[PDB]
Design a protein around this ligand. Structure first.
Ligand SMILES: *C(=O)c1ccc(N(CC)CC)cc1
Lengths: 509, 509, 508, 509
């Protein structure tokens, strides 16, 4: 029996969810594709069903979205910002129930569920002001009687593919920025968080409908690999923002590049925390814990590698283990719980696989490493010591709560060890040395898109451009001038004079 | 026998050119790959020889360049700008002999040869000031006692692959920007302009060596497709700047995405001039002429499509016909010449082929279309009417002086025809209508990277970012914030406070 | 009796307004100064009274404001933006009663009273995003192992003196930008719009109070010339944003410059519309009309000079006559009314004085020019022809609905005539000539702070920096990088190396 | 007799200086005012004479510069940059003789004389690139069919009044920026450095004339307070850049404000150095020495106040006195000499008076404090301890090598002590504490325009905006966006649509 049919989950109806929901929106609701059932990862019980998009659904949707763009692009950017502001308020009005759904279908703890929705509300308030600012410089032309200007226009249709772990905010940050930039959007979320994608889409839909705007401006085509690949190969998709694993992201990027389209890739992470001898241990230990076990280690910015100086290595590990024992586990919707279940049953298997490989490669499990004997997809937060820093499994992103601890001696080698992996999302060092801090930020420091000091790998905010380097994709979202990725630059020369070109010996007229 | 061994060409020696020249520079001069002889396209005679890089030479060069980066990247950006300043002066001191070499080996007329070198001089002076400006904003953090900064660092090794038509300035614009940004450069130019590449490298090498800097900061590895492919597949090449055809650029782009590297693609063009009924025809006819026949139609920004409104179609054509008949043909280095040869004999084959396919697709040759009985690779400037705007040969970049003329009635359809091709480099309308001019610059206007008004498609300067959209690659060079393509962005959060994270019910210390 | 005591004006109570109101706020409410009574320009009746600030009130308010700054400047800018966001929402909840108060105490039509409040609401939303963006560039130092950064910090206390014609939004645009930039604010509104100042202050106070912040962050000291003069001389006022007449602003600027303080001046205007022969007359006539008679000619951006090409002059004027006679007059809060009363009785007399002085200078009144025989400060919309462009009364800002119409021949001279006056706020041409348009925007073009094409002199918005040149002050508000005027710049070089200076022959 | 008649100073003729020189340059060279004689501060001997500007000279010059502006303003900004580039070149060619003139007439040592000319050279190279960059943003209008652009135009005539201590570079940095911004310049340098002003003018004059440009673009009218006051009152001076004392600057500022003009004020300084307990003393001692005695303590950024923590107070003071004794004083035009003479005889009097006023204030001279028995205006570098930090002479800018030393205990109070004075030009702290450094840069830190860490108060470069706060004037020169002070902003809304305003119940046509 589906949870949404049980009286205790009647609050799901406040998001407009039913026993069977439509997973396509383009002004109209539909879905002739495969009917998927999503499950609560805390108890493996089925919640509700979503009818995904068929190829024909995708086709019709893309066409409706591009026709809607003809209208949306002619709307002044500040007025597009007004729509985004209204989307912000609309999310506020549903922040608790939507945050509850995120906890229910995805499995993160409630304050992170609500918090993720707040991140979307926050990016909306940000995009409202940015909508009056987007543009380029007026340059002084070297030619008398000419103007030189930099114009920015929408790319057209922005395809948005998102991962499971942040089923609201990742789309949200692409949505808010793309909309003020005059783009229409097409969403294909993770299949396992389909209800969430429908819930958000319903909220946005009403805002567009109340303002007499075509709903295809924020289109939805639920589905899996097939819909996603279609988006990657569709020339009508002017920008494809892909958020997910490196393995899938590599193929999406290659498909987009094949058709000379634009891609925005936000891929995997393997982020390290480095603790030098002069570090504040009262700061290092709790920072490492929450960055490693937060969301059960299912953040792209999760701390997965911990380099500690030889002098303080044993102490920091011992203090970590005593703190790992206090981590409260249970239902994600339980306010006393710090630590929820993994998203899927396969995630649990990957967890055990990495643990076994780590041990085989000489590692030692000083805490955890076992599956919790209880309903749901619960595993113990895990700390592994002894592995060589260049161990294969350590160089591999395992989307699970496993922290590999390494020893080091000097600044030069430990910087290289942070950079020696293929991923390049987030990084952090903990130290008080002024010279070291700036070298860390310099050309011989971290090669990551996020480079932090005395704050763990999860430290980011709206004002800055978010993304990573190398195998992380190189794309950027949110702040700074990240909006430029959602627009096309044109360099324009306007001759307003009555001057004629030099004839060069040629008799004209 | 070689031209360089003749008295009238003794000026070649002033560029340090000999009978056979080493085609590899990395601090040392060498080359053990295939020997190539480059020819003057004006008379099809051998000039001199260059010993190209072997694969082993390339490996050695990359190693030395990356080692040279360790030193170059530690040098303050303004001091890197001082180096670029001296490069500019060195080019100034050799501008006539180098300009002549460009005219001799590539085949553009002398004023454009010198002019191209002048462009490298100008971008150097520009980069000097820019070296003191590159960087990111300090942002206000949402967290108390935290600083949020945006850092920019060199990507490292910048591979530059350039085309034949601008064998100096294309590399030059990439070089000046990359160097102030802290990168080392490895250059592979077009094989048929190898002497020009060696000459430029000698000039830069002397500056680097006079400043006691490792010469591998500006490395050279002359070679063909194999050396290029090696660069495209080399992980040690952080950024690959490719300037060339779309066919080759597509494959280069894919190899780079395959290894999650960075590419900058400046590819083919099929640029259109659109003349409206209200256009000043005394401005249109000369603008169209010079944009079409300039550099024997071998500019990437060459005008290849000419849309004329029905009312003025025949008048513009006749005036172009009478104007074309006055174009002065001769050797590039001859005074007061306007039109030289095509670069290769194969390029002449393409010319004839496109002409044949044109009249087979319904086109009429109203001027030119034939080869000139003269030493070298000389063809007649050509005007073709009657072709449908969607004809296959019209949607193709034929790098020869062929101008396709079309009729249009209204503004909506003619904007679409400019945009319907796969290329998206440059575009121009000639009109006096205020509204139309802004619609042209707007979201419903040209889709090109360069959108001009009352100035032909060749209209571009340093101050702005240069590049195109769609199949042109998306890359940008020179002005605005194009320097960000040669650097990696990091978003950095610095905790300078003594605050500790919330305990969340866990007892630490 | 007072208007606030009559049943039909009971809606005033929704704004916290009483018979007699405190005109001082600094976390606490008070007022031991003189009691002022403001009046309704539509019927010359008293609305309610306000206790203005005494000297002691001013002193304790400044001190409390600078104390509150120690807390406010430590609050991260994005969080300050959140406060400004809540102020925006609080304004939305009172947008109709506040807009009605503006129509009542100031005199503009209801849609503009509401419209002015909406402008404050919009600048708040704008400031929210901007609060995450304010800052300077990290620059590449020429010194190895050195960092070069441009920092921006709040100036501290920002004094805000405002005019009567826009008694809500002018303060609003200053308040929103100043707050995200980390400053505290002291507001001295126009005396004749004291109730509006109190009402707006009550709205902001609750938000600050609900968020457990010191109320002095947005302080209010109602008062006249003496309080304003004090702010101009007070070294504890790090920035004085002044919005008012040129005459007053000049003295304000000199006092602030005397003590090496910072000033932001937004002063008078004498804004011109120029209609060339190639202009769309269907655009020119209604644009000229609304720009000239809007808010009874009481905008700083109001069109006062109209230059028309001699070939279209007579046609334009005639069409303006026919349009002017359809202008609907009445109560500003009454529907379909386009035209309310002047702000004060003094303004009416100044209106008549300019009319007579224009006749004596050789001008001709082709429409209006008289006082309307009705309750309130109502005067007819006026069009004056025949004056020479260099006439004294034309060069003078008369804050009243008077439009001076001139003829011109060439583009060169008419550009000079727009620039020849002392004011330099707004300017507009109506033409289709591509070249002329860019010349208008160029070095030989308009010398004004606002330079418009095919849109009248009142064409402005939030995204742009708002201000004028020459006798208009030179200050800027709202958009672009106008926030820099509310902060101080510092250029910082940071040596993080272990390298020592060159000994230069000396042994250490 | 004059020093320009002794063949030992024959090199003065390389700058085109004669016995009596014209001090007025517009299109022509004139001077009907008083004839001033300038003296070498090292031997109190007359060098040469300069015929200064009469009132008629000033009126003619002003009128001629405004006519020249009509031509100069039509010249594209990048082409104006080319002129500035040539100015930089001409200075390079005369850097040795002009630098020697600075040492002769002003009194600073030769490397600082040549170095000051190099500063002008460098800002010229900086300006060239900037001239392609100046402008405002294109913004999205909230109105359909409307463009919103920010424009920047020259202010017109930029009047420049400069001090004695930097008689080349201060004008230089004003000139380079003002010119590329399209303004003409009127220069009135310090009366005591008249020869330098004329020499600099002659260099620029040759450049302008060789380019067939009206020489009035860089006009010169030598004079004292009378010419300066006329500029401050002149409505035809759209911008007055004043560089000098706070006393004079105040009155200048008031006059310009009286007539609603623009002023850029760069005034007095009273710069402090704060050394905390955790400071590297190997860095502090030489840093404080060179900052205090540099240019005989006649820099506007000279360190005049020195706050040392009580724990390290006695040591640092001793080390300074030990190093102070090693300072090699002599002729400025002589090698290995670190300290030269004061500029005038009146400067020596002010020096002694300040020494006396500090003794009566309870301070103790621990080194120097007396005049040097030798020709010229030579004084001993002085160190004063025991003074109260709020002593009247301590808050006073005495333009002589006098360093007041104060003790402190905690961070909050010593920050206040740096800000407690009227001056706010430059400030420096020396420490390693991460949190302290950021607080120093924060809202509760220094109130100065230059806020340095681990570098003396003389630390400034081209890239950043140079200027101070409070009684220092508020003006900014050189880097960042300081160029906006030389131009006027306009916010331009362009209606390019065919739309008509709402009739509001009125019948039109
Ligand atoms: C002139 O009357 C005037 C100037 C500025 C404003 N603002 C901007 C601060 C409020 C909309 C209103 C009126």
């Amino acid at each position: 029996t589906l949870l949404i049919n049980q009286p205790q989950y009647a609050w799901l109806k406040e998001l407009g969810l039913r026993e069977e929901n439509e997973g396509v929106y383009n002004g109209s609701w539909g879905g002739r594709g495969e009917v998927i059932t999503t499950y609560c990862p805390a108890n493996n019980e089925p919640i509700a069903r979503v009818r995904q998009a068929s190829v024909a659904d995708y086709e019709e949707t893309v066409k409706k979205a591009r026709e809607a763009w003809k209208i949306w692009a002619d709307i002044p950017a500040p007025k597009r910002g007004e729509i985004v502001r209204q989307i912000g308020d609309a999310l506020r009005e549903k922040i608790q129930v939507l945050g509850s759904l995120v906890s229910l279908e995805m499995g993160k703890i409630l304050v992170e569920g609500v918090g993720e929705v707040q991140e979307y509300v926050d990016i909306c308030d940000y995009a409202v002001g940015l909508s009056r600012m987007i543009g380029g410089p007026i340059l002084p032309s070297e030619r008398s009687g000419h103007a030189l200007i930099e114009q920015w226009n929408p790319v057209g249709l922005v395809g948005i593919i998102t991962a499971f772990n942040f089923p609201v905010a990742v789309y949200g940050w692409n949505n808010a920025i793309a909309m003020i930039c005059g783009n229409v959007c097409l969403w294909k979320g993770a299949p396992t968080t389909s209800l969430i994608s429908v819930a958000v889409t319903k909220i946005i839909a009403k805002v567009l409908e109340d303002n007499k705007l075509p709903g295809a401006i924020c289109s939805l085509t639920c589905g899996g690999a097939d819909i996603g690949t279609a988006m990657a190969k569709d020339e009508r998709v002017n920008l494809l923002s892909f958020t997910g694993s490196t393995q899938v992201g590599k193929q999406v990027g290659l498909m987009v590049q094949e058709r000379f389209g634009r891609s925005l890739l936000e891929l995997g992470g393997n982020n390290a925390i480095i603790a030098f001898e002069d570090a504040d241990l009262s700061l290092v230990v709790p920072s490492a814990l929450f960055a490693a076990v937060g969301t059960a280690g299912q953040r792209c910015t999760t701390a997965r590698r911990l380099f500690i100086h030889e002098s303080i290595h044993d102490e920091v590990v011992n203090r970590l283990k005593k703190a790992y024992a206090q981590i409260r586990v249970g239902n994600p919707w339980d306010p006393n719980v710090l630590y929820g279940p993994l998203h899927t049953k396969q995630a649990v298997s990957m967890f055990l696989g990495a643990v076994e490989e780590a041990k085989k490669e000489g590692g030692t499990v000083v805490y955890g490493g076992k599956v919790m004997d209880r309903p749901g997809n619960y595993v113990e937060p895990t700390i592994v010591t002894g592995l060589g820093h260049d161990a294969s499994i350590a160089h591999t992103e395992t989307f699970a709560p496993i922290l590999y601890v390494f020893k080091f001696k000097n600044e030069e080698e430990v910087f290289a060890w942070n950079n020696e992996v293929k991923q390049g999302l987030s990084s952090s060092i903990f130290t008080k040395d002024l010279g070291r801090i700036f070298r860390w930020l310099g050309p011989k420091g971290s090669d990551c898109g996020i480079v932090n000091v005395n704050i763990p790998t999860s430290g980011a905010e709206i004002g800055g451009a978010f993304g990573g380097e190398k195998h992380t994709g190189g794309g950027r979202e949110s702040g700074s001038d990240a909006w430029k990725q959602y627009m096309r630059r044109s360099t324009c020369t306007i001759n307003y004079s009555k001057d004629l070109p030099l004839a060069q010996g040629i008799k004209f007229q």
